[PDB]
Structure 1
Amino acid sequence: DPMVTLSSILESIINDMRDLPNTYPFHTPVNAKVVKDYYKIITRPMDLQTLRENVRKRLYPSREEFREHLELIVKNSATYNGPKHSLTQISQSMLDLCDEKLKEKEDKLARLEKAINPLLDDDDQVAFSFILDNIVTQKMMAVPDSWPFHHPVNKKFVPDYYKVIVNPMDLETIRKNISKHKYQSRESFLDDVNLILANSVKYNGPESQYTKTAQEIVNVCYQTLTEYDEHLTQLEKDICTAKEAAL
């Protein structure tokens, strides 16, 4: 079972990062009853013990989902402690070691990832995802003043955001989904794109400048999809065929 082999590699990387100097504050969940404002500032807590338990629950089918959770440890430290705090440097040292190990094992990891999910090697899936990513970076992120939608809201700067928006979305998360080949057709992609606009209507109001920007993001998305409709339709057909053959 390639999921077992993958999980054993990921656990070995956790063992290696746990062994780096001064990393203990990241080995287990923050005690939010001691660090009393922690959840008022941090939205996605993560630590090496939770990461290991997730590896064992088979939650990570690839390098990328594991690395995204590992990166939360660094991002959380940067937000709570500060970008140059020694704790953030320590957490970064674990992410750096992870990247070294993933690089060392990249061919084996690619093979396991392909055995777990054959669509990651499907040329039509790859071409489709490449087009979506180009739409996001060259058209949607090029909308003037679209910066509020490029990355997840940091609760440190907008403290009530996630009490209002419980199903958040942003363009970086969409790009990560594309990189993970989450989207097999335009429908799921447009579900996430439209969630950005719906959340702006809810949080900012229908007449806010934020919402006008989100509307323009959605509109240039539709326009660019229409320009590539015939290629995208063929790719979606061939992806569906690959998905059915994987049965």
Structure 2
Amino acid sequence: RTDPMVTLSSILESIINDMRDLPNTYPFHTPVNAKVVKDYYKIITRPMDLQTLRENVRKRLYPSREEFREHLELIVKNSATYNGPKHSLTQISQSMLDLCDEKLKEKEDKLARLEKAINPLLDDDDQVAFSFILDNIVTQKMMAVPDSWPFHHPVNKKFVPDYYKVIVNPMDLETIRKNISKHKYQSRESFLDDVNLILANSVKYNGPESQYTKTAQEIVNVCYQTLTEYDEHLTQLEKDICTAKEAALEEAE
């Protein structure tokens, strides 16, 4: 039904409107003009204002109130650094953060519902356990294939100078491991898409009968064979991962 990120962005956008409506807050509505305050950006490394904050909300940069409030408190931190810790402008910027925390407390439970629907696998040990199993299939089985090392890392353009001009979607075992650590794979199908892409790239570049294609084929065979070996436990984790995401979306509805 409803996209939880859209609902969260409308709450955050509303909060920006309320802070912007507070009196004397104009110096924080828009970025500091470097042509007027010519030494400002020599002091403030991370500038922030209400307009930039609204631009970040509309581009869906904040998955929760935590990242949103972090950038908002930066407005108070920057004015404390430039104008002073107890300057009048820092007090005004603090009144914006005070009203924000008041609005976040009012919608405390709907925000928690929305953030869980946006990041369902946050602290979910089923996703970590599933990722861990996939990583072991790579390191214990696929990387153990004899002479598989050319597939362990991205192709080195220094020695294969035309590879990235021919292969549009390169894939390797390190890139898959990095995807695993990021929990990109919620089931074994997306994982197998990248594994099979390694073999298809070797078929295209090295040729169907090349020694490297035969090694990549064995990398694929041992991966399917190991997934078959762990099929029951993987199905359990895949079930719990998928149902956790759907339940979060239902609770946020």
Q: TM-score range by the shorter chain?
A: 0.5 to 0.7
Q: Does the 8 Å contact 1:125/1:184 carry over to 2?
A: yes
Question: Which 10-residue stretch deviates more, 65-74 or 206-215?
Answer: 65-74
Look up the match of 2:87: 85
RMSD after superposition: 11.5
Once the two structures are superposed, residues 24-59 of structure 1 have per-residue CA deviations (whole angstroms, 9 ceiling, x without a partner) of 999999999999999999999999999999999667
Q: Does the 8 Å contact 1:29/1:45 carry over to 2?
A: yes
Question: Which 10-residue stretch deviates more, 112-121 or 200-209?
Answer: 112-121
Q: CA deviation at 1:163?
A: 1.0
Q: CA deviation at 1:22?
A: 41
Question: CA–CA distance in 2 between the matches of 1:208 and 1:93?
Answer: 68
Question: CA–CA distance in 2 between the matches of 1:165 and 1:171?
Answer: 16
1:32 aligns with 2:34: yes
Residues 243 and 11 (structure 1), Cα distance of their counterparts in 2 relative to 1, 3 Å cut: closer
Q: Does the 8 Å contact 1:200/1:210 carry over to 2?
A: yes
SS of 1:83's equivalent in the other structure is coil
Q: CA deviation at 1:243?
A: 1.1
Aligned equivalent of 2:135, options 133, 139, 145: 133
What is the count of residue pairs matched by the alignment?
Answer: 247
Q: CA deviation at 1:124?
A: 1.1
Q: Does the 8 Å contact 1:114/1:120 carry over to 2?
A: yes
Question: CA–CA distance in 2 between the matches of 1:65 and 1:77?
Answer: 19
After the TM superposition, which parts of structure 1 deviate over 2 Å for at least 4 consecutive aligned residues? 1-118
Residues 134 and 170 (structure 1), Cα distance of their counterparts in 2 relative to 1, 3 Å cut: same
Q: Does the 8 Å contact 2:152/2:172 carry over to 1?
A: yes
Question: CA–CA distance in 1 between the matches of 2:212 and 2:83?
Answer: 29
Residues 245 and 102 (structure 1), Cα distance of their counterparts in 2 relative to 1, 3 Å cut: closer
1:115 aligns with 2:89: no
Question: CA–CA distance in 1 between the matches of 2:206 and 2:46?
Answer: 23
The sequence identity of aligned pairs, in percent, is 100
Question: Which 10-residue stretch deviates more, 148-157 or 211-220?
Answer: 148-157
Q: CA deviation at 1:171?
A: 0.4
Question: Which 10-residue stretch deviates more, 20-29 or 159-168?
Answer: 20-29
Residues 43 and 111 (structure 1), Cα distance of their counterparts in 2 relative to 1, 3 Å cut: same
Q: CA deviation at 1:246?
A: 2.2
Look up the match of 1:5: 7
Q: CA deviation at 1:105?
A: 26
Residues 144 and 32 (structure 1), Cα distance of their counterparts in 2 relative to 1, 3 Å cut: farther
TM-score, structure 2 as length reference: 0.55
Question: CA–CA distance in 1 between the matches of 2:85 and 2:125?
Answer: 39
The structure having more radius of gyration, on CA atoms, is: 2
Question: Which 10-residue stretch deviates more, 33-42 or 171-180?
Answer: 33-42
Q: Does the 8 Å contact 1:42/1:76 carry over to 2?
A: yes
Question: CA–CA distance in 1 between the matches of 2:135 and 2:83?
Answer: 33
